């Protein structure tokens, strides 16, 4: 205030400072572009490791003795002696071991150990998540900057939906949000092609066979009512803000905060740290 | 601009846990607080410069409060000021 | 914090910095800002209690500028002090 | 019916307020009844007026009436527009519409606004244009005017009305009034260069100037003189507004020239009119002369000057009403001639016009006026108007000059002399000549050789005429002429000292006469004149007491009539200070008898009133003090001053009960007691004690009490040896007041008095404080405790040092009572960090602990040392040995050293209870 | 669940060990990621240096705004809300001689620091006295030697009466290994020894003087006392460790002081300097 009230020397100096601030903002935009370039470069390196561990989890690939020895050394250094092998376990025959190819409920257990997401999991969701194979992440290069999330389900054996892969997208605002980071923009997701309503874990089902009392017609009814679930992660909040959605926009903003928290948790902890969260050591 | 927001809320809740206040009235209260501070500090500076001591001590503040506030208000402001100084001096 | 040490919620730091920028004296006794902050918080608490009284006079638990003005009206001595 | 009658019957007012406060369905019922009354314009007139009033008041305001509100709105539009509706009903509808626009529809209420717009454009309903004028007055906005498009549409309507010559003259009046409204709104946006607004302004002004050029060229025979006068008035008011407010580029100089010619012709026509008409003529001439003033820069032709001068002479002549008013009461003449009168008329506008001319035009006007007044000398009827025109010309602060100015000036001077001499000359013409001669001399202070003899002769002649003639108007006019003479030249130099004294005497006599029935503003004028006289009062040895005492008595008589008159009071201050500014030794003993008794008269007069506040009373107290101080008074004041002043001042202080009088009288009385001889004062020293006892008592405000302390200082200083029996009275009064008073400054002053008494004698003060009791407790218990409490907040190094010395005496005395007396102050905060309000503190106040007075004063002095500011060894009596081997700090350190030397018996015991931090402060102070 | 963990077949335990090895490999990849980020951040600090130096010159008054930058600042002001900078007619009537009597922006850096939430709480008035002479706050990344970032505080010896050091700098150091989350983790910090002109002007200590003919020792001796006190300039000379005292006393010292020190350093580095103008005017809040 009084700095403005000071003579025009101070005002002109502050005007020059604001011009330099705009120039610094341009430099900061180019800085953010370079950071995204390098981040994508190293995400290309991240992806092979995540895919390899997903193959191990699903049983599509087997470990190797050198990897097992290195993991033994790493566990011994970590002090997490729970993973250590015992002679009683060694007594198990190959036939007993091969009864399950992948780790039973690996992703389900990891998400259960996760602080917030586990709350969203119901029993039917837990059953469905057993068919979840991989979780993938990607960056949005075109248009608005952002990152995309992917899940892989063994749709061939999945009795709930035919979606082979489900992808979740996030968006950021056009310019640089203050403090030099990006602020969220609304998110979009896919729709699940449920095989039937009974298997639809996002829905509770009611079956009715009736003879109408008014028209005396004969009819069989299949009825639907949505319920909360881990797959409510999909069908995300529609739009950031629109005239017709305001009443919806309330819940959209609340669920946007919650879903962005969940997605940040995924991106930072789970996808980069899956082993410890499954075992619970990350707790 | 003056901001005593969180502390105004704390004082209000301590006085009335079930009562709240809107930010505009809070800014008006900040204006009142600033005016009180200005008058007290100005007259306390008057007393400090008047004496060769040339210092605004707690005595200067107490005298300024006694000169400014009415009888009961002055007495209670002095009481709480001395309370705070004694608590702080521990 | 100094405010916590004296039990005050208002920040003794802000009052001391206001005194410094005003430069009301060549030196300030350390107890002086504590005393001044305590007096300011006393008057703020008085005004807030009267504002609660006014909001209750308005059958509401939320204080608004109308309630603050009515509270100032309610207390004659503070009415003349604040004006 | 009951709804209307009850609302318009005390049932009438009860029902009206009940309606207004309802904002209820009950209002909707009575509101429905009133709306039906309004609709039936064929009957129920008075109830319709009442309904309109109530609706106007109601709209200012819970909205159940909304259903019936719109019905009455739609009815009210018709009620306003239908010209057959009654006048007052129409006005009610119109301003109700304006109020509704203000509250509900600040933006256009489309139905009403468009309907009135169309009605004005087509049918020309005058009430509609009046409604629009008030609408622009009240509810429109400049942004709405420019960008809302209302301004352009209105201006187009007005231009169409003015263009359609078939429009009636009254329609032209309405159109021009609305055009003034439009220009007022337009000029409000002085932030030109706004492209849309600037273009709108340019087009509007160009079209308006064209049309107003057309309108004036019109002639209307003799159809209606009043309407024609209003028409010209509003046109020229438009033109004056344009010429004044808008840029020179808009109002070009060629248009100025042609409008000037047309305005001169209009002056001719308006003067020829009169073959309330006169009032309309005066108004139209006011506006025409305003325009002429504004265009005065342009050239003027000889015939043009002749026309202007003759027209103004006809216009400016006093109406018989004004002449009768002035002749009946000279007070009105004094008020108007002095400029204090609020009325503004044609003559004032002529004054404005003449003052503004440039030098060549001004010179030509002066020549023309001199030539005309030469001929008009025989024609007395127009003479006063022409004299006033000459006065206005000469009042123009510019060099009147020209070729033949000398001869015309000789003729003018001779004419003025003849006007003065002639006995049959009418009163007002003589008064105007008297007031005009000073201007004539002033503007020709040069180029008029023998100016000094002529000034002497004219001043003497005018004063003689004022004295001999007994027409009070002439007396006041001559006083004002004298006032004008004073500014013109140094009368003493031109008159000489003897003649100057004679003129002072004569003016004093004139003031004495006219002052009999002067009005308050006339009193102010007389005070100014007397101020002028006083200045010439020679301070040289020629000074005579006759003039001085006459001036003093006049000053007091003039002001005494209206004491509450503040302006007269301040002018009396100025005159009185100019009087007292004289310095001559022997006569300052004559002033005691000369001026002082006049003051006593003022004091006695207020005595019946019990000396309630009066600006004159404050003035006299102030100047008594100023006189007492101004007198040499290096030695004792002459005893005569005491004999006069003491009794009136004693009564004033004993009886008065308001702050200002008590304060001023107290300071004056203190000075009198201080500077007078103690011997002569000694026998009446008792009376001062009665005064002091009265003031210290609570029957007066504390504003008086605090000033008592210095008064007691004076009493003890002058009468240190007679006071002793009276000390008990002073001490008991001051102590009883101190314990009861709570004002900070008052108790500080009273404690200063107690310190003064203790320094005078500590044992005596202790004894009185112990013996005297209030509320059946020893005063020391209350007095010492409150003293210590107050000392915590005393201010000033002087009072701090006095407190230190007094408490040192108390400590040394070491009586039992001073030991037993325990004081309140040692604090522990109340439990909890919660902020204690007054309501809270009523149950949870902070707590204090008590110690003997000696411990408390030791703690206080230690704290003060702290503030002003192995060494931690205990047994400080040994520290003194190690240490021993005018400011507060120095004196207090010396006090502590002496205490450690002497009072070890009690001081050591106190030291043991002392805390370690206090001991550290004591150690560091000992350095 | 320990029971479940025991329930896992030996083969699945081997698979989990392999997955943990993959996680370690991801950790090394994160190390390389952080190295690349540090290098490019250093590059962009070099890029920022010119603008920061220019605004510093503006703040100190060493440089005057040009009309082009003035117009750019004005049009930026028209954006959002900064009309405080719009020069009024009254100021244009002023002359540079009258305005230049005060050169630079008074207490620019002091105000910027005191507007910062966490850090301002540590600045006492005694510290603020030195901050009046602060005219620059610079960043330096310890590319050479141990990793870390260094903060630089600049003063004028001929002007300030406190110390003879024109530049006071603070240093922060990270461990050779990344944190668990992938972010950098901290190592013990260090600070410079302030070259106080005299102990009286020193702001981090309180002194006392006394002189006694002490009979207890038959010594006519003069004594001096120094006591460390709380002050923002304690931000330097950070704590260090001695094993035996480290285990008992300095455990809490590292728990408390290091957290606050690192928080203050990060807040400065990130929030303050990149938005120095907004922080000074408070718009960065």
Residue numbers in the entry:
A (entry chain E): 83 to 365
B (entry chain C): 37 to 126
C (entry chain B): 17 to 99
D (entry chain A): 4 to 12, 16 to 67, 80 to 293, 302 to 895, 927 to 942, 963 to 1004
E (entry chain D): 81 to 365
Question: What does the original paper state about this entry?
Answer:
The importin Kap114 transports H2A-H2B into the yeast nucleus, where RanGTP facilitates histone release. H2A and H2B contain disordered N- and C-terminal tails and central alpha helices that fold together into the globular H2A-H2B histone-fold domain, with very basic surfaces that bind DNA in the nucleosome. These same surfaces are shielded when H2A-H2B binds the Sc Nap1 dimer (Nap12), which is mostly localized to the yeast cytoplasm where it chaperones newly synthesized and folded H2A-H2B. The mode of H2A-H2B recognition by Kap114/IMP9 is well understood: the superhelical Kap114 wraps around the H2A-H2B histone-fold domain, occluding the histone’s DNA-binding surfaces and functioning as a histone chaperone. Here, biochemical and structural analyses show that Kap114, H2A-H2B, and a Nap1 dimer (Nap12) associate in the absence and presence of RanGTP to form equimolar complexes.
